[PDB]
Amino acid sequence: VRYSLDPENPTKSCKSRGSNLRVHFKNTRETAQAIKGMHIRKATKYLKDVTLKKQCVPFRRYNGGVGRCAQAKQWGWTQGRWPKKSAEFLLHMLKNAESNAELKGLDVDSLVIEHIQVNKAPKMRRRTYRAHGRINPYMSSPCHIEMILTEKE
RNA sequence: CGACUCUUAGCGGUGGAUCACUCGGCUCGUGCGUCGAUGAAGAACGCAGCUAGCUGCGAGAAUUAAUGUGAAUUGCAGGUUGAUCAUCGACACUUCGAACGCACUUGCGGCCCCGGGUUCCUCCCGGGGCUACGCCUGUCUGAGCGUCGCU
Ligand SMILES: [Mg+2]
Ligand SMILES: [Mg+2]
Ligand SMILES: [Mg+2]
Ligand SMILES: [Mg+2]
Ligand SMILES: [Mg+2]
Ligand SMILES: [Mg+2]
Ligand SMILES: [Mg+2]
Ligand SMILES: [Mg+2]
Ligand SMILES: [Mg+2]
């Protein structure tokens, strides 16, 4: 599958991919920007802390009306949330990348998430009912998620 | 440095433009110029080993016979003295519908002939053929203090 970014060392790099994932794209982008510079153990621990509301995802671009928490000050930001479903989906995908690395025989504890990006999947359609006999869209915003690990010691 | 924002490029998404195709339309021209009470057009309901739609067909129901052709149909199974296709002149063609026994509930009949029932004794059941309107010619039966003739 044609990836967006090629790895600098494909022997020591593994890939994972997911398409048409029923997650909010904006929450997925902000948490992937949080994951993007991390080692795999730190990323797994921080994604568990997001679901347990111990560490937050800073909302940097899509932050309109997003409330302010105390835990965002570790990121140099004021607005943060804890997207649970979005943290679990790219934890399942991170486990898939773990399983793909173990298949290639790469070292488990040296994996650093080198590339990750979130794209917009095709939007799927439902319908809501408004006043004065008007019917409005109830569109979902699913996402494609892409990541590449790299042995970085 | 970092976040955020702007511009450009690479790659990836969203979207289906452009191009190239076309068993489709539009227009012109030619030949023929054919429906129906022997039941038309239209509609309804059914019919396939696995079948919803489209198509084809009518209880003989994706067809029967005959003729031409000549080894297939096919998504999967099953089984040359002619498989399949095409032609189509034979046979068949459920219900409503001008729609025809009366009505349109799928209801109520009447007449005749058969088979069970019975042993012609009417019942009951099943089957078949008739039972609409208008109108032409002829037949039969009639009507009139209509016009007459005769006993
Ligand atoms: Mg903003
Ligand atoms: Mg506001
Ligand atoms: Mg409402
Ligand atoms: Mg209303
Ligand atoms: Mg770009
Ligand atoms: Mg059928
Ligand atoms: Mg035949
Ligand atoms: Mg033949
Ligand atoms: Mg009634």
Which ligand is in closest contact with the Cα of A4? 5
Residue A53 zone, left/alpha/beta (φ > 0; ψ -120 to 50; rest): left
Break-preceding residues in chain A (C–N over 2.5 Å): none
Q: Which residue has the tokens 């070292």?
A: A107
Is residue A152 within 8 Å of A114, Cβ to Cβ?
yes
Distance CA A56, CA A60 (A): 12
Is residue A143 within 8 Å of A119, Cβ to Cβ?
yes
Phi then psi for residue A34, to 5 deg, are -70, -40
Q: How far is the CA of A26 from the C1' of B136 (A)?
A: 92
Q: What is the DSSP string of A120-131?
A: EPPP---EEE-G
The answer to whether the C-beta of A76 is closer than 7 A to strand B is: yes
Spatial CB neighbours of A17, under 8 Å, sequence gap ≥ 6:
A1, A3, A144, A145, A146, A147
Burial A72-110 (b: 16+ CB within 10 A, else e): beebebebbbbbeebbebbbebbebbbeebeeeebeeee
Closest CA to A113 of A146, A89, A77, A88: A146
A12 sits in which H/E element: none
| Model resolution, angstroms | 2.8
SS3 per-residue string spanning A29-67:
HHHHHHHCCCEHHHHHHHHHHHHCCCCCEECCCCCCCCC
Residue A127 Cα to ligand 4 middle (Å): 15
Closest CA to A27 of A151, A152, A142: A142
Q: How far is the CA of A46 from the C1' of B145 (A)?
A: 129
